[PDB]
Amino acid sequence: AAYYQVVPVTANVYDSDGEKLSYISQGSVVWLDKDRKSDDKRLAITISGLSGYMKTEDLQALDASKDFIPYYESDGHRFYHYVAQNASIPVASHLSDMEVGKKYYSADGLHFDGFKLENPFLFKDLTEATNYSAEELDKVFSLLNINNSLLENKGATFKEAEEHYHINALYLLAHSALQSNWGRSKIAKDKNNFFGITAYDTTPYLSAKTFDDVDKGILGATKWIKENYIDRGRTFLGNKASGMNVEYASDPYWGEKIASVMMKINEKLGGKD
Ligand SMILES: [Ca+2]
After folding, report:
1. Alpha carbons 219 and 163: distance in angstroms, whole number
2. CA of 190 relative to ligand 1 center, distance in Å
3. Domain 3-61 adopts which CATH fold?
4. CATH 2.30.30.40 residue ranges in the chain?
5. What's the CATH fold of domain 123-268?
6. d(C-alpha 69, C-alpha 62), whole Å
7. Cα(12) to centroid of ligand 1, in Å?
8. Which of 1, 79, 192, 208 could bridge 199 with an S-S bond, Cβ 3.0-4.6 Å?
9. Alpha-carbon distance values, 3 to 14, 45, 159 (Å)
10. 3-state secondary structure of 24
11. What are the backbone angles phi and psi of residue 62, rounded to the nearest 5°?
């Protein structure tokens, strides 16, 4: 087949030496890479920018005439990634080279056969501060109709985290927005954990770290991200080939999803970043 889906809760992606490069989630769809050798035991695949090998034991062949394969499509205003059959995210503005309502396929969401996208927030250095003030960040809750969020009116805490730890506050707001549903997930509400800190795929709720209150959750997650990712050379969101997404989450499109939120917030707040 041309496309395969991940069967177990997570599966590893390996290099040609058998070393682990990353891991991806159940249901993820990988592309067969016809430029490298596959065998009965391992398939040469590509996912979210990463070219490696996966065990056939971890995969099920798809038929693209009847099974969902992730794709990109323009509505004539924004270009969307269908990351699941019933879920799309905006990743870029419409380009004149895009046909409205036509499905496009890409292993990285950057290179398409007739156009190339810039996803600047995906690769932005997260140690550079945002140009948004605390009050500006707080305005986006009303502008995006975000109701009953634990993160409402926390712009000052995000900017304090940025000041102390040197991590972009727009990224911190976007990461917490995406991963905890704007601080409305059960992990957010029960554990003040807005960033999926130690929320491992096997037992995400039980494994998730607990923080003392909302502010200590923002600051404590920022400390954890600084110490475990930024200080270890993972300084941008990225994908399965480079950046925080290699290790932070099994979801191949975690980085793209956070970059999409950054893009949405940035547009609502007047394009200062
Ligand atoms: Ca190696």
Report:
1. 11
2. 41
3. SH3 type barrels. (2.30.30)
4. 3-61
5. Lysozyme (1.10.530)
6. 8
7. 14
8. 208
9. 18, 9, 43
10. strand
11. -105, 160
